[PDB]
Write a protein that binds this DNA or RNA. Structure first.
Ligand SMILES: [Mg+2]
Ligand SMILES: [Mg+2]
Lengths: 104, 184, 227, 144, 143, 68, 313
RNA sequence: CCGAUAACGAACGAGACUCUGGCAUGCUAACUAGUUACGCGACCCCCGAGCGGUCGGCGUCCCCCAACUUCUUAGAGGGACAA
């Protein structure tokens, strides 16, 4: 064996990330896994603000760009020989995954 | 019962003028412990009519630019001024403040561009004008002087409430009335 | 584990990889109707999908060109050997793609003809390919020595609000002609209908649709049907 | 007697400052961050902090045990959050555990004196825009 | 009763504790305590002969109600606003030597020690005699 | 002050009234639910703006013969 | 010779009161499920201007509360609301014990079984579910239910012949049996949507109302039809007298009371209109509940008041 | 926008829209956020009061040696429409 592992899911898209978390969690719960639910880490907003003009002429307008990162944590309590295949069938190309042991 | 600052019981003051007792808020329902609240009194017209008078005085006292958010300073300034006033005359400080506001608000004014006609003053503009004149008089009296701001405010209020032609406020009121009379 | 990068820097680097890959692949196979790219990153062998119009020459002779393209990608971006593979897909409804139509306009202009005739032909092809509306702008040293701009709008086109983020698509090209460059700007408003692939789902926010009622007959004298 | 689990936890807010009041069943003890109400921050606004106990009297507070922790905000904002939390916590404790008419009378005697004793003030702060030092103000403009 | 440090006014608590701490002459005071300038963002070394005892008092109080503090924590605690000429003002930290010296002198009284992590914290002796001083000052104020 | 409804709301409400008059009443919330379930309105604000105008129009109809 | 006279009002909650529930075991408390997301227990202290005082308010519902009932022992209360969930309350400080994570859309009516064992809910997502008393649903009924919103759902009060009825905006009075939850009759004959149904204390006849204005009686044993009697405008509530005849109905801003041996109107009960400006139509009546002795009736109006009506002479 | 009407039917811009602020003791949850409760450990008072007071002291998910989500986080929904 009984191994505690943790799955970290990060994406820039909220809805697809929650789809991946939901399908992984329900696939775990149907397989007799004790799972601690998706813990949403506070979102990170990267906030480059720039001058909007190639030259220096004009009324001093600014662009305000931002990119948001969302994180979730899922905990599993069985060996990796089922969780590797249950996460390989949930890809959804915007999500980047680390799987790690509680011992890590 | 409420007895602002823990002394100076409120339900003995009298506002003689009808026109200004509609717009002065020292009575029993506007009777509060401190002249400080997050009122949201500026959201509509005439909501400053129901703001209590002591808090309007503290609001106008927090002004010359180096004092803009410093409200606790003005609260203790007003507290000290009220103790000085009651110690000087023995009258309720609320009553003498009310009398000063009565006696310092002008009742006729003149305005145009092409000061041509003399007009009348609404009985909310004269409350604002009286408070502004009193605070300005206290501020100018205390500027380069050994006297602190509290007893300058105190002597401004007592001289205005007696009526002496010796306050800044009643001098300004009389001069405004005179100029308004000149072109009535 | 041994080498680590913070998540902010990691996502910014992923975006920079996508931008540089898209620009290089635009610059390389522009004469093949490139029209965008997709990357599928995974903690194993990754995939890059090229959404060309003509895939039979994106793939070279027996796929030589796709092989040298995955070779240069693996040699530039420092992928380990075999961890990157490169695919090609033919795009459906090339008349609804702004990049392909802007390249077609560039091809016609470089071949040489009236700018009017080329823009009219591109515009009417875009319309009969299924667009809700189109807008083609050509700007530069046209007939004459002073620069003009000419737009060839037709149909329906939105400009403001959030729906113009996903519901039209634009493309800007430069045409290196004999006397300076001309600028090509093509905007295509996409249809909504199938909620599938040819356009987007979630229709325009001020378009309500009301379902029609049924017949609703026999309100007459009471009857009861038992089982 | 010693009926347990008689407790509520009610918050109050002023612009960032959140004070959460824990109202147990005890005998007349009220404390903020472990220190009493009379040993609190700047004490110019001490009446502003203990005006609920002056309005309701000590008989309403004689059977409760308030314990308030407060985070965020400034000095004054924390004062207002504290007093709003205490009043709202007493109202919640009365409504959950004693009769509803008592809640109604404490609630309305709080409403005819400074409504922010029970309702939060929603005005937070405005963002700075890129043409001047603040939300509304603009940088000085030069003509010649 | 009662009472503790928390439920008495901290101003005359620091005054009373500094008086107690000066009265029992075991606090080690360095030799340069009259030329210090105390945190370079200010001038004019304090208008007191006995500023060291009051600083040790307030350090002991701060370590009582928030433990694990080090020299960086104390130089953040006693920091202030540096008026900076014609340039605008900024925040500057306290003097590191005076914080280290008051901490070491208080360790010499066996009322603070380095805990298992970094920083320092009160002994049972330290919180004992601070609560006794708190009782003394509370009884003085109420009566 | 500044609560004029645009022609999107007005003509959507008119078609809703014309087609589904029997299931609507002078209650904003039930009209809101009906308009939610008989029309694909993409946003909540537009949905209950349309429902508010439907309520107003049914008070007008219950008075007399407006169009209708 | 019998008239109804109002002995005061029950003030104390600001919203549309939508349901009144009374209990037979302790006739000093009633429930008021209103539109301010609360349920109120009242102390029925028969006084002047103080006929009822609110005694405890039950919160925990996210949106408007639609229905409420009382258990046979008068210890538990069950209520559904417009947040799409049910909630089982109790007396003794009124904390919810169980909550029923149910329909996708919002519920409209709940009903205790005869033995307080089965829980049923009719909802706006066009489904009906029967529930276990601990929270779990047994199974929903679908694809032969109403094709519109399932309005009020009632159980037969007798354990013999367990019968559950279901009106709806489908203009059908679909009746299900508790043995296997299959359809047994398919009553047609209404012209508009149906607001409520009620079953008589004997499980023989039921009455349905709606936008027709016809309080349209039915039969349960032979189950073919009975007489139809039409009162006024929109019908909001229907309930039979508990010990006696005189079925009543809430029709607009007045409640009409009818006997059954003979179909005459017995009385008309209106609020006395003051300051008639001819601008605002009078406040409708939204709920009716007898006090389990046939002596007083509580009528819930669409302003924030509920009226008690007392029999006279 | 209502209406009037040699115009009728439309298209863009406005509005809708997107992000943000303010409300949910209702939902989904959390040893990378906590809160109550409990058990230890320090001090204060006591004559003993004590289920007393303070603690950002320790522990209570290596599995029961506790529950819960008010406070924190962020998802789904609700909520305001001149009703
Ligand atoms: Mg806009
Ligand atoms: Mg500023």
């Amino acid at each position: 064996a009984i191994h505690r592992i943790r799955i970290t899911l990060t994406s820039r898209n909220v809805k697809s990330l929650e789809k991946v978390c939901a399908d992984l969690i329900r696939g775990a719960k149907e397989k007799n896994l004790k799972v601690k639910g998706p813990v949403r880490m506070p979102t990170k907003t990267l906030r480059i603000t720039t001058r909007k003009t190639p030259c220096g002429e004009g009324s001093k307008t600014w662009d305000r760009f931002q990119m948001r990162i969302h994180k979730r944590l899922i905990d599993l309590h069985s060996p990796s020989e089922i969780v590797k295949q249950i996460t390989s069938i949930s890809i959804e190309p915007g999500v980047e995954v680390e799987v790690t042991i509680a011992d890590a | 019962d409420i007895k602002l600052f823990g002394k100076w019981s409120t339900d003995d003051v009298q506002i003689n003028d009808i026109s200004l007792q509609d717009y002065i808020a020292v009575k029993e329902k506007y009777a509060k412990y401190l002249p400080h609240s997050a009122g949201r009194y500026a959201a509509k017209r005439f909501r400053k009519a129901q703001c209590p008078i002591v808090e309007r005085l503290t609001n106008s006292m927090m002004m010359h630019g180096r004092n803009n958010g410093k409200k606790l300073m003005t609260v203790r300034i007003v507290k000290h001024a009220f103790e000085i006033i009651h110690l000087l005359t023995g009258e309720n400080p609320l009553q003498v403040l009310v009398n000063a506001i009565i006696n310092s608000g002008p009742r006729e004014d003149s305005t145009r561009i092409g000061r041509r006609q003399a007009v009348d003053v609404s009985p909310l503009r004269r409350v604002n004008q009286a408070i502004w004149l009193l605070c300005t008089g206290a501020r100018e009296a205390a500027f380069r002087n050994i006297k602190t701001i509290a007893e300058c405010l105190a002597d401004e209020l007592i001289n205005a409430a007696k009526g002496s032609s010796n306050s800044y406020a009643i001098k300004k009121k009389d001069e405004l009335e005179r100029v308004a009379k000149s072109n009535r | 584990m041994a080498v680590q990068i913070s998540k902010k820097r990691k996502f910014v680097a992923d975006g920079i990889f996508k931008a540089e890959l898209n620009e290089f692949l635009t610059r390389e196979l522009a004469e093949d109707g490139y029209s965008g790219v997709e990357v599928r990153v995974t903690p194993t062998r990754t995939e890059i999908i090229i959404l060309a119009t003509r895939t039979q020459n994106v793939l070279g002779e027996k796929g030589r060109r796709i092989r040298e393209l995955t070779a240069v990608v693996q040699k530039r971006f420092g992928f380990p050997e075999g961890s990157v593979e490169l695919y090609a897909e033919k795009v459906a409804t090339r008349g609804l793609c702004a990049i392909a139509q802007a390249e077609s306009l560039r091809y016609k202009l470089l071949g040489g003809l009236a700018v009017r005739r080329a823009c009219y032909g591109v515009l009417r092809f875009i319309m009969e390919s299924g667009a809700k509306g189109c807008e083609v702008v050509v700007s530069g040293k046209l007939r004459g020595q002073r620069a003009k701009s000419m737009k060839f709008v037709d149909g329906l086109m939105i400009h403001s609000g959030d729906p113009v983020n996903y519901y039209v698509d634009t493309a800007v090209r430069h045409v290196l002609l004999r006397q300076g460059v001309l600028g090509i700007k093509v905007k295509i408003m996409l249809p909504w209908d199938p909620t599938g692939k040819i356009g987007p789902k979630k229709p325009l926010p001020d378009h309500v649709s009301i379902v029609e009622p049924k017949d609703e007959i026999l309100p007459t004298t009471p009857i009861s049907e038992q089982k | 007697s010693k009926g347990p689990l008689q407790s509520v936890q009610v918050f109050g807010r002023k612009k960032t400052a959140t004070a959460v009041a824990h109202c147990k069943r005890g005998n007349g003890l009220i404390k903020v961050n472990g220190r009493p109400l009379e040993m609190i921050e700047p004490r110019t606004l001490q009446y502003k902090l203990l005006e609920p106990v002056l309005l309701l009297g000590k008989e309403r507070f004689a059977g409760v045990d308030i314990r308030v922790r407060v985070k965020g905000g400034g000095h004054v904002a924390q004062i207002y959050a504290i007093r709003q939390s205490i009043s709202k916590a007493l109202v919640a404790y009365y409504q959950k555990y004693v009769d509803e008419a008592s809640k109604k009378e404490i609630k309305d005697i709080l409403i005819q004196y400074d409504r922010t004793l029970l309702v939060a003030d929603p005005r937070r702060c405005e963002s700075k825009k890129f043409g001047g030092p603040g939300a509304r103000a603009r940088y000085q403009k030069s003509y010649r | 009763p009662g009472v503790t440090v928390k439920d008495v006014n901290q101003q005359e608590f620091v005054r009373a504790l500094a008086a107690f701490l000066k009265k029992s002459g075991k606090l080690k005071v360095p030799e340069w305590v009259d030329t210090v300038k105390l945190a370079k963002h200010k001038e004019l070394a304090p208008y007191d002969e006995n500023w060291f005892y009051t600083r040790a008092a307030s350090t002991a109080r701060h370590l009582y109600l928030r433990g694990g503090a080090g020299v960086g924590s104390m130089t953040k605690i006693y920091g202030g606003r540096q008026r900076n000429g014609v340039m605008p003002s900024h925040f500057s930290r306290g003097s590191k030597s005076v914080a280290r010296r008051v901490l070491q002198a208080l360790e010499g009284l066996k009322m603070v020690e380095k805990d298992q992590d970094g920083g320092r914290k009160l002994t049972p002796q330290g919180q004992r005699d601070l609560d006794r001083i708190a009782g003394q000052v509370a009884a003085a104020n109420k009566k | 002050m500044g609560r004029v409804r645009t022609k999107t709301v007005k003509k959507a409400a008119r078609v809703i009234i014309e087609k589904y008059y029997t299931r609507l009443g002078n209650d904003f919330h039930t009209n809101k639910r009906v308009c939610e379930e008989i029309a694909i309105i993409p946003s909540k604000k537009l949905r209950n703006k349309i429902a508010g105008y439907v309520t107003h129009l049914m008070k007008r109809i219950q008075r007399g013969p407006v169009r209708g | 010779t019998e008239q109804m006279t109002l002995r005061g009002t029950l003030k104390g909650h600001n919203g549309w009161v939508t349901q009144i529930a009374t209990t037979p075991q302790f006739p000093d408390m009633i429930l008021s499920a209103s539109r301010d997301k609360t349920i109120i227990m009242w102390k029925l202290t028969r006084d002047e201007t103080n006929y009822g005082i609110p005694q405890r308010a039950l919160r925990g519902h996210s949106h408007f509360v639609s229905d409420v009932v009382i258990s046979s022992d008068g210890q538990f209360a069950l209520s559904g609301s417009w947040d799409g969930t049910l909630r089982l309350w109790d007396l003794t400080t009124g904390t919810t014990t169980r909550r029923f994570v149910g329909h996708t859309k919002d519920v409209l009516s709940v009903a205790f079984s005869s033995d307080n064992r089965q829980i049923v809910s009719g909802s706006r997502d066009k489904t009906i579910k029967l529930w276990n008393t601990l929270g779990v649903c047994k199974y929903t009924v679908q694809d032969e239910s109403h094709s519109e919103w399932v309005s009020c759902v009632r159980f037969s009060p007798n354990s013999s012949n367990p019968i559950i009825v279901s009106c709806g905006w489908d203009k059908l009075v679909k009746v299900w049996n508790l043995a296997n939850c299959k359809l047994k009759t398919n009553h047609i004959g209404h012209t508009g949507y149906l607001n409520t149904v009620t079953v008589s204390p004997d499980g023989s006849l039921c009455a349905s109302g709606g936008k027709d204005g016809q309080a349209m009686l039915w039969d349960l044993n032979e189950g073919k039809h009975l007489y139809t009697l039409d009162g006024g405008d929109i019908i909001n509530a229907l309930c039979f007298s508990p010990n006696r005849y005189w079925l009543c109905a809430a029709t607009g801003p007045s409640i009409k009371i009818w006997d059954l041996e003979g179909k005459i109107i017995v009385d008309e009960l209106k609020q006395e209109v003051i300051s008639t400006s001819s601008k605002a139509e009078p406040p409708q009546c939204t709920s009716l509940a007898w006090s389990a002795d046939g002596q007083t009736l509580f009528a819930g109006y669409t302003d924030n008041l509920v009226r008690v009506w007392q029999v006279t002479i």
